[PDB]
């Protein structure tokens, strides 16, 4: 859904449609998300600080 905002999500309504179903058959109790960082010429290129 396109929007022009930073924070404090709008009050508009939008449903969610499924895309694909995954039949694992195994319970899940924990989850974690992944992010991608950039290594430009400004940073030294080491993933320490």
């Amino acid at each position: 859904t396109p929007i022009n905002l930073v924070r404090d999500l709008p009050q508009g309504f939008s449903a969610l449609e499924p895309l694909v179903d995954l039949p694992i058959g195994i319970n899940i109790t924990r989850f974690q998300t992944l992010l991608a960082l950039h290594r430009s010429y400004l940073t030294p290129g080491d993933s320490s600080s």
Binding site: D21, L22, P23, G25
Partner: protein, 49 residues
């Protein structure tokens, strides 16, 4: 192996003309595709002749 939420045909898994041996009890080989089941489990391992 566990298979769920998939529609597959065994005909191509039989017309390879390369399997040395074949065995299947309980259901006729020519009428198991129509007979619908819930889940199919594959037990893959190696063994001597």
């Amino acid at each position: 192996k566990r298979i769920s939420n998939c529609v597959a045909d065994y005909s191509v898994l039989y017309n390879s003309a390369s399997f040395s041996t074949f065995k299947c009890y309980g259901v006729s080989p020519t009428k198991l595709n129509d007979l619908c089941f819930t889940n199919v489990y594959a037990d893959s391992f190696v063994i001597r002749g």
